[PDB]
Tab-separated table of all heavy atoms in Angstrom:
chain	number	residue	atom	x	y	z
A	1	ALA	N	120.790	138.050	119.473
A	1	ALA	CA	119.584	138.494	120.158
A	1	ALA	C	119.859	139.689	121.058
A	1	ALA	O	118.973	140.527	121.262
A	1	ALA	CB	118.990	137.346	120.973
A	2	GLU	N	121.072	139.788	121.600
A	2	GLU	CA	121.381	140.849	122.552
A	2	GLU	C	121.705	142.165	121.853
A	2	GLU	O	121.356	143.238	122.357
A	2	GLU	CB	122.549	140.422	123.442
A	2	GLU	CG	122.938	141.432	124.510
A	2	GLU	CD	124.127	140.970	125.338
A	2	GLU	OE1	124.838	140.040	124.898
A	2	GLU	OE2	124.350	141.534	126.429
A	3	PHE	N	122.375	142.109	120.701
A	3	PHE	CA	122.874	143.311	120.048
A	3	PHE	C	122.329	143.547	118.648
A	3	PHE	O	122.442	144.673	118.150
A	3	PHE	CB	124.409	143.281	119.965
A	3	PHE	CG	125.087	143.211	121.301
A	3	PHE	CD1	125.846	142.106	121.652
A	3	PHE	CD2	124.976	144.255	122.202
A	3	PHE	CE1	126.474	142.045	122.882
A	3	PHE	CE2	125.599	144.200	123.430
A	3	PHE	CZ	126.348	143.095	123.773
A	4	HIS	N	121.755	142.538	117.998
A	4	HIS	CA	121.301	142.650	116.618
A	4	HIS	C	119.809	142.363	116.501
A	4	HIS	O	119.341	141.772	115.525
A	4	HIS	CB	122.108	141.729	115.710
A	4	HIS	CG	123.573	142.040	115.690
A	4	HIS	ND1	124.092	143.133	115.026
A	4	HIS	CD2	124.629	141.402	116.251
A	4	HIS	CE1	125.405	143.153	115.177
A	4	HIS	NE2	125.757	142.114	115.915
A	5	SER	N	119.041	142.778	117.503
A	5	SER	CA	117.588	142.740	117.444
A	5	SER	C	117.062	144.162	117.554
A	5	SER	O	117.621	144.985	118.285
A	5	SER	CB	116.995	141.858	118.550
A	5	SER	OG	117.362	142.326	119.836
A	6	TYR	N	116.002	144.446	116.802
A	6	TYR	CA	115.401	145.768	116.740
A	6	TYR	C	113.887	145.610	116.749
A	6	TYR	O	113.356	144.533	116.461
A	6	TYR	CB	115.824	146.539	115.477
A	6	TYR	CG	117.318	146.641	115.233
A	6	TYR	CD1	118.067	145.524	114.879
A	6	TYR	CD2	117.971	147.866	115.316
A	6	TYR	CE1	119.433	145.620	114.642
A	6	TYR	CE2	119.335	147.972	115.078
A	6	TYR	CZ	120.063	146.846	114.743
A	6	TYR	OH	121.419	146.953	114.505
A	7	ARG	N	113.194	146.694	117.078
A	7	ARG	CA	111.738	146.745	116.985
A	7	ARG	C	111.408	147.628	115.789
A	7	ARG	O	111.525	148.855	115.861
A	7	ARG	CB	111.105	147.275	118.268
A	7	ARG	CG	109.604	147.033	118.362
A	7	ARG	CD	109.099	147.315	119.764
A	7	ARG	NE	108.451	146.151	120.358
A	7	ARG	CZ	108.518	145.834	121.644
A	7	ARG	NH1	109.230	146.554	122.496
A	7	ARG	NH2	107.863	144.762	122.084
A	8	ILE	N	111.002	147.003	114.690
A	8	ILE	CA	110.726	147.704	113.444
A	8	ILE	C	109.237	147.996	113.347
A	8	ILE	O	108.396	147.267	113.887
A	8	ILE	CB	111.209	146.890	112.224
A	8	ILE	CG1	110.536	145.516	112.203
A	8	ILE	CG2	112.729	146.750	112.236
A	8	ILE	CD1	110.944	144.655	111.019
A	9	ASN	N	108.910	149.078	112.650
A	9	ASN	CA	107.530	149.449	112.367
A	9	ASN	C	107.294	149.366	110.866
A	9	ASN	O	108.252	149.222	110.096
A	9	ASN	CB	107.231	150.864	112.870
A	9	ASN	CG	107.554	151.042	114.339
A	9	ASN	OD1	106.699	150.842	115.201
A	9	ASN	ND2	108.792	151.428	114.633
A	10	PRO	N	106.048	149.447	110.410
A	10	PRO	CA	105.809	149.576	108.970
A	10	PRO	C	106.622	150.732	108.405
A	10	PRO	O	106.761	151.784	109.034
A	10	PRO	CB	104.302	149.843	108.882
A	10	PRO	CG	103.744	149.235	110.126
A	10	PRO	CD	104.795	149.419	111.184
A	11	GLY	N	107.172	150.529	107.212
A	11	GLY	CA	108.002	151.534	106.592
A	11	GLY	C	109.473	151.441	106.924
A	11	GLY	O	110.260	152.240	106.398
A	12	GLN	N	109.869	150.502	107.780
A	12	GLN	CA	111.268	150.236	108.073
A	12	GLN	C	111.643	148.843	107.586
A	12	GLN	O	110.785	148.002	107.309
A	12	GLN	CB	111.562	150.337	109.576
A	12	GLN	CG	111.338	151.706	110.190
A	12	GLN	CD	111.603	151.700	111.684
A	12	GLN	OE1	110.943	150.984	112.436
A	12	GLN	NE2	112.584	152.483	112.119
A	13	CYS	N	112.948	148.608	107.495
A	13	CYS	CA	113.464	147.287	107.181
A	13	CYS	C	114.756	147.084	107.955
A	13	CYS	O	115.467	148.043	108.267
A	13	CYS	CB	113.697	147.110	105.675
A	13	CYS	SG	115.058	148.092	105.005
A	14	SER	N	115.053	145.828	108.266
A	14	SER	CA	116.237	145.492	109.038
A	14	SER	C	116.904	144.275	108.420
A	14	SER	O	116.250	143.456	107.768
A	14	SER	CB	115.886	145.219	110.504
A	14	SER	OG	117.051	145.026	111.283
A	15	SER	N	118.212	144.156	108.637
A	15	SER	CA	118.964	143.042	108.085
A	15	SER	C	120.195	142.785	108.943
A	15	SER	O	120.683	143.671	109.651
A	15	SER	CB	119.362	143.307	106.629
A	15	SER	OG	119.953	142.157	106.049
A	16	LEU	N	120.682	141.548	108.876
A	16	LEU	CA	121.914	141.135	109.532
A	16	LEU	C	122.858	140.551	108.487
A	16	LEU	O	122.459	139.695	107.690
A	16	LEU	CB	121.626	140.113	110.637
A	16	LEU	CG	122.835	139.447	111.295
A	16	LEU	CD1	123.698	140.469	112.013
A	16	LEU	CD2	122.387	138.356	112.251
A	17	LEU	N	124.098	141.033	108.476
A	17	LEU	CA	125.126	140.556	107.566
A	17	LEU	C	126.262	139.946	108.374
A	17	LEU	O	126.513	140.346	109.515
A	17	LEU	CB	125.670	141.688	106.673
A	17	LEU	CG	124.773	142.342	105.612
A	17	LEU	CD1	124.296	141.324	104.585
A	17	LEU	CD2	123.592	143.071	106.235
A	18	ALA	N	126.945	138.969	107.776
A	18	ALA	CA	128.038	138.266	108.432
A	18	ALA	C	129.229	138.158	107.490
A	18	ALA	O	129.072	138.060	106.271
A	18	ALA	CB	127.613	136.865	108.896
A	19	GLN	N	130.426	138.168	108.071
A	19	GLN	CA	131.654	138.092	107.289
A	19	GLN	C	132.715	137.374	108.107
A	19	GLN	O	133.040	137.812	109.215
A	19	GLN	CB	132.142	139.488	106.894
A	19	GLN	CG	133.460	139.492	106.131
A	19	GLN	CD	133.366	138.756	104.809
A	19	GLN	OE1	132.551	139.099	103.951
A	19	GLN	NE2	134.195	137.733	104.641
A	20	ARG	N	133.252	136.286	107.563
A	20	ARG	CA	134.375	135.607	108.193
A	20	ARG	C	135.678	136.306	107.828
A	20	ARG	O	135.884	136.712	106.682
A	20	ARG	CB	134.431	134.139	107.767
A	20	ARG	CG	135.585	133.366	108.395
A	20	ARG	CD	135.806	132.021	107.716
A	20	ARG	NE	135.209	130.907	108.446
A	20	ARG	CZ	133.948	130.516	108.322
A	20	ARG	NH1	133.101	131.155	107.530
A	20	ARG	NH2	133.526	129.456	109.008
A	21	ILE	N	136.557	136.451	108.815
A	21	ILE	CA	137.847	137.104	108.631
A	21	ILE	C	138.913	136.215	109.252
A	21	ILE	O	138.835	135.886	110.441
A	21	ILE	CB	137.881	138.507	109.256
A	21	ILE	CG1	136.789	139.385	108.644
A	21	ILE	CG2	139.250	139.142	109.073
A	21	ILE	CD1	136.694	140.760	109.266
A	22	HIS	N	139.903	135.822	108.452
A	22	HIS	CA	141.003	134.998	108.948
A	22	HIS	C	142.055	135.926	109.549
A	22	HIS	O	143.088	136.242	108.951
A	22	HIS	CB	141.544	134.109	107.836
A	22	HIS	CG	140.528	133.139	107.313
A	22	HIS	ND1	139.759	133.393	106.196
A	22	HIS	CD2	140.122	131.934	107.781
A	22	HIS	CE1	138.939	132.378	105.987
A	22	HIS	NE2	139.139	131.480	106.935
A	23	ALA	N	141.758	136.374	110.770
A	23	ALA	CA	142.547	137.316	111.549
A	23	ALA	C	142.064	137.263	112.991
A	23	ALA	O	140.897	136.932	113.236
A	23	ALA	CB	142.413	138.738	110.995
A	24	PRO	N	142.916	137.570	113.966
A	24	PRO	CA	142.475	137.529	115.364
A	24	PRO	C	141.434	138.601	115.644
A	24	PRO	O	141.308	139.592	114.922
A	24	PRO	CB	143.761	137.787	116.161
A	24	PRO	CG	144.878	137.478	115.211
A	24	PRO	CD	144.355	137.854	113.851
A	25	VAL	N	140.682	138.385	116.724
A	25	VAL	CA	139.603	139.305	117.080
A	25	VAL	C	140.148	140.712	117.281
A	25	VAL	O	139.617	141.686	116.735
A	25	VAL	CB	138.866	138.807	118.336
A	25	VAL	CG1	137.848	139.841	118.816
A	25	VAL	CG2	138.182	137.484	118.061
A	26	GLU	N	141.211	140.843	118.079
A	26	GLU	CA	141.713	142.171	118.418
A	26	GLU	C	142.274	142.892	117.199
A	26	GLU	O	142.281	144.129	117.160
A	26	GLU	CB	142.764	142.068	119.524
A	26	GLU	CG	142.185	141.666	120.877
A	26	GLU	CD	141.089	142.607	121.352
A	26	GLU	OE1	140.947	143.706	120.773
A	26	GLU	OE2	140.365	142.247	122.304
């Protein structure tokens, strides 16, 4: 909600994708 929310208008599209990675954050 803080970083992956947008205000879209007609003629736009938005999406969120996710990917698990077996590796440390840094």
Side-chain angles (χ1 to χ4, degrees):
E2 182 182 17
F3 300 116
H4 299 286
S5 59
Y6 307 69
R7 194 168 238 145
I8 58 179
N9 305 269
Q12 297 178 299
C13 69
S14 186
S15 187
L16 172 63
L17 293 300
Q19 177 62 58
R20 180 193 261 86
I21 302 176
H22 298 95
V25 173
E26 290 303 346

